[PDB]
Structures are given as structure tokens and as C-alpha cells.
Symmetry: C3
């Protein structure tokens, strides 16, 4: 099987036959319970978009672990110049890796890479649909509500990670609509509570989304579930 750990914000660690981390915003993440040294051996890094609180410590983690970063073409070009190993994809594209299948999904957001003083173009933002041993995980990344999420309903997602913080992403209300579009077996709220600007009523989300027949698992940073 596999162990899926939420480490705060948009961060998600997947431990199976290979170890995969999504949007590794670790150092500088005020709600992340672990340091970089607290992570296990990392094989793959998934980056949804270029923003600092998602790209995060991908360069350091990749180099330390000899890990491969999976992201869009533009983000992978940026990382390639830093001496990071990459497997470039793009939106709606999928590839079968040794551990399983990764598919980039559409998102409505931005993908600017802040490099010192300059905003570098990091392609278009995404989510990830990950298929491991028949099980399906959806990490929406940063996104607003979008009708492209309806395309995921036929996938029969087991666990969906959705942002609920609002302002930069979907709020509670729109996240509930997203859950109804996607119809995952379980939903985990994320990308909230990190700062005051993205405070969200997570208990209200659980209540509202479970009224729509979708099980909601509120994971505190550090907590995990099994698939």
C-alpha cells in the first residue's frame, strides 16, 4: 500500500515503493511540522506552479536526494539551469513512471517564479492526478473553481486535496462546489490557516461537503492516511 502525509499548506508526502513529495514548501512554512532533514529519502518532486510557497525547497531537496522534479516545461527549464534533474510535462499530459502514472490537470491560477527581484515565467499552473496501484490521488494545486474539474468525475478519485483558504484560491463555498464536480471518495482541505489572509472555517467545509455525500478528512499538518 502507501502512506499519504499532509505536511501543511499545499504540501503532500506520498510514501510507497517510491517516495513522492508535492509542492515542498518546508523551510519558511510556518505550519510545516518538519525540517528538510525530517523528510525521508525523496525519489520524485511534483511542482504544481512557480509560486514560492509551492516550488519551495525543490532545488535543495532534489540535489540532496538526487531526485527528479516533475513539472511543466517552463518550470523544468528554470530548474534545469540550477542543475536539477527534471521530467518535463504539460497541462493534460500524462506519463507512466516506475511507481505509477502522473497526469498534470488544468488549474485557474498563475505561475510566476520570483527569482530575486525578477518575476520569471513559469508556464501555466496545474494540479496532479496520481495513479498508484489502482489508487488515485488528486492534488488541485493552487486553483480557483473551474469547469475542467468536472472531467475528473469519471476518474473516481480516492483522495482529493483541495485549497479552501480563499483570496489566492477557492474559499470554503467554492471548494464545496469543486468537491461536487469531482466526487472523490474522500476530500482533504489544504492551503488554509498558514497566514491570516487565508484563514478558513475548516469545520464548516467538512460539514457542508459531507452534506453532499463526500467524506471529509481534516488532516492537521503531520497527520496521514492510508490507501
Amino acid at each position: 500500500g502507501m502512506k499519504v502525509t499532509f505536511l501543511g499548506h499545499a504540501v503532500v508526502l506520498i510514501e510507497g515503493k517510491k517516495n513522492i513529495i508535492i509542492d515542498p514548501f518546508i523551510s519558511g512554512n510556518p505550519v510545516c511540522p518538519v525540517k528538510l532533514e525530517g523528510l525521508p529519502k525523496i525519489d520524485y518532486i511534483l511542482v504544481t506552479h512557480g509560486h514560492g510557497d509551492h516550488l519551495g525547497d525543490a532545488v535543495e531537496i532534489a540535489k540532496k536526494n538526487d531526485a527528479t522534479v516533475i513539472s511543466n516545461y517552463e518550470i523544468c527549464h528554470y530548474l534545469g539551469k540550477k542543475g536539477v534533474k527534471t521530467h518535463a510535462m504539460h497541462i493534460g499530459g500524462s506519463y507512466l513512471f516506475d511507481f505509477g502514472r502522473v497526469k498534470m490537470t488544468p488549474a485557474v491560477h498563475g505561475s510566476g517564479i520570483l527569482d530575486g527581484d525578477s518575476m520569471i515565467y513559469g508556464g501555466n499552473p496545474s494540479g496532479f492526478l496520481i495513479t498508484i496501484e489502482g489508487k488515485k490521488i488528486y492534488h488541485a494545486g493552487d486553483t480557483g473553481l473551474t469547469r475542467e474539474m468536472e472531467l475528473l468525475a469519471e476518474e473516481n478519485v480516492d483522495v482529493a486535496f483541495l485549497p479552501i483558504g480563499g483570496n489566492f484560491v477557492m474559499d470554503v463555498e467554492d471548494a464545496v462546489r469543486a468537491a461536487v464536480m469531482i466526487k472523490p471518495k474522500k476530500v482533504v482541505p489544504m492551503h488554509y490557516g498558514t497566514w491570516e489572509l487565508i484563514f478558513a472555517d475548516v469545520e464548516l467545509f467538512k460539514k457542508k461537503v459531507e452534506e453532499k455525500g463526500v467524506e471529509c478528512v481534516i488532516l492537521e499538518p503531520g497527520e496521514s492516511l492510508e490507501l
Copy 2:
């Protein structure tokens, strides 16, 4: 109560408990009836995307009024470096300000910021759904027809500003389709006639859109309506 004035092209002004201007392309706008001096006290500035005919005089207006620019993260970064006060958001995110709620809506467009001879990355383009005193205003920004507009149907928008100029945006035919998808109480056409390249038959738009059951108010630049 509030007064909503179309200044022609993409330009819009909302006067209520606070004054809000959307896409302030004033100086250099051949169809704009006012100078910068003609504008009242501005509290907030909304920028849909980075193109010059929408970004416009955001910097000058912001500084002279001590106003806050509301836009996406990448645009707010660019403006921040020029000494402008900002409230960063992104696509599908909303925030409750003192005057009311602003929500960024997805749009199909570009968002290049022309600085000198360089094309700076300005995130992804957007529209704005503005909720003030129970009234809803939709400013589509620059956009082509998109299925995301159907998400606004349940909002029961009071006034929708849609581009009809074509070429850079929806033409008359697609704007009619957008109006039917959104089904607002009123539609106001915009972003046409400024140059010959974006000539549109605005009277034909009114006829066609009203045949589909959506009232069209053709506002000349300078003309307003009351909410």
C-alpha cells in the same frame, strides 16, 4: 446605492461608499471622455490583466490618491516595485473589503506587461465579480468565450460588462453566447470602437442579445446607470 459609469473602452468607474475604478486606461484613450484630473477621489483600482490599455494609468492614479490596486500576484509584484500599494489575489479567489466583496474570475486571454521593450509576465488574465450592497457587477475584462462563464449563471449578476470588439476579444456573436451563458439582468457592451481594428456593430449586438432575452444597455463613454 451606487453610480456605475462607463468611461468607454474597458474603462469603468463605480461610485458608492468607496470609489472603485476598473482597468483605468485614461490618458492615451481616444474614446475616454475624462482626463485623470476629471476622476474623483479613487480608493481602489482593479486591474484585469497586464496589457497597457487596461493596466493604463494605475500607477499614477494609485500614488496620487493613496489608493490600493487589487490584481493578481504577478501584476501586484510589478506594481509594488513602482511604489504602489497592492492587495494581491488570484483567479477564482475572493476577499471581503470594506466596500464589499471582490472575486477574480477566470478569463481566456493574455497578461503581458510591456515595460520599455520587455514583455514582463503578469500572471493570468481575469475578470471581476464585485458584490456591493447585495448588487453584483461582472466585468469580464478582456476575454474570449469560455465555459467558465457558466459558473456565473447562479450568481444572478445585475450588470455584466462584456467585450464585443473582436480580434483581441469576443466579437458580437460570441458575446451574445457569453451573455446567454451568464444570463445577467443587464448586459453592457464594451471594448469596441476605440480603434478601427476593434470596430463592432453594437446595435446588432443589442438586437441579437435582446432576442435571446437579455436586456442590453448601450452606454456611451461618460454615460452611467444606477444600482
Copy 3:
């Protein structure tokens, strides 16, 4: 009438009253049967997005032929600084040229322009809907599956070029879903086989898409069809 020639990868040549080429990745394209010299007189060049394997030889072809490049505002700005004639548009915008109508369609992808070692921002990616003498050609460009494709169903497209290579774009299974959304009279697969990373079972695509009631025409690079 007109002759439509697939020249491998995303490349498509349309020969009629005027000569139009889409995404002219000629030199450095190992599956393209022709050299640049092998192209006829080119009147217009269509560029879906900034990636090198689509932008291709647009600059050189344009200069040699005194041709006009049709692409989004940001791409046309880049090309403009290299002394290329351009007609700028954007997503969902259309314009009536002497040969016929061109409309930019939404795509879910990126649009980075690689200039030396810098990733220049090239707007948002697109497809093209081209109307010539009542005939409609859809070139999807690089894209994942998107609900925006359903907007094209009412057009009754005659020929639709869809990528099936996977990884960077739709794979076989998603391209079939796209074909069903669009319901063209004919579908031609493309953007596969060029490298090992984008290998695709083109015969399986034909079989599966024709089961859904859409005729599939497999064109090897160099082959053509009449409209």
C-alpha cells in the same frame, strides 16, 4: 478548393487562394519530409504557442516570403522586435482575412519562448479555427483535454487536427474524448512519433475514435487531403 498537407509533428500547410502554414517546425524536425526550400510561397504563418517545436522557423520563413505571422499579442511582440510582419490577436478573437476567417481557440498548455537561455513570456497557448470558402479546419495546437473544446461542436468542423503523443499533450484516450466533444466530420492525429517520449498507438486512436462515430484519417508526413 484547397489542399491540406500534414508535414509532421504539429505542422500543417494549407494551399488555396493564399498559402498558410501552421506551426512551421521544419528545420530540426526529424519527421518533417521537407526542407525550408521545399515550401511554396507562404503568405501567412499561424503560431499556436511559443514553444520551439511550434514557433519553429517562423522568423526565417516570414522574412524570406514577406509573410505575416498571425499569433497572440505577446508572441507577435517578440517577432516584431526581429523585424517580422505580424497581425496580433488573442484567445477567442477572430478576424476576416482576404483568404478567410481565422479564430484563436482556447488551449490548456504553456507558451514559453526560449531565447538563448531565457524563457520569454509568450502569452497563453491557443488552437486555430480557420474558415475558408465555407470549410472549417481546427488545429488544436498543443493542448490537454479541456471543456472549451465543446464550444466547437456547433461549428460542424470539417477537419480537426488533434495531438495524441501524450506527456506534453493529450494521449490517445483523451484525444478520443476531445474528438467526441468537437464532433468534427474528420479527425487527423498529430504531434506524436516525433521522438520516443511522445510515441503513440495511432492505429488504436483510429479504431477507438471511429467506434465513437468520428471518421479518422491517418496522414503520414507529406500526405494530404482535399477540402
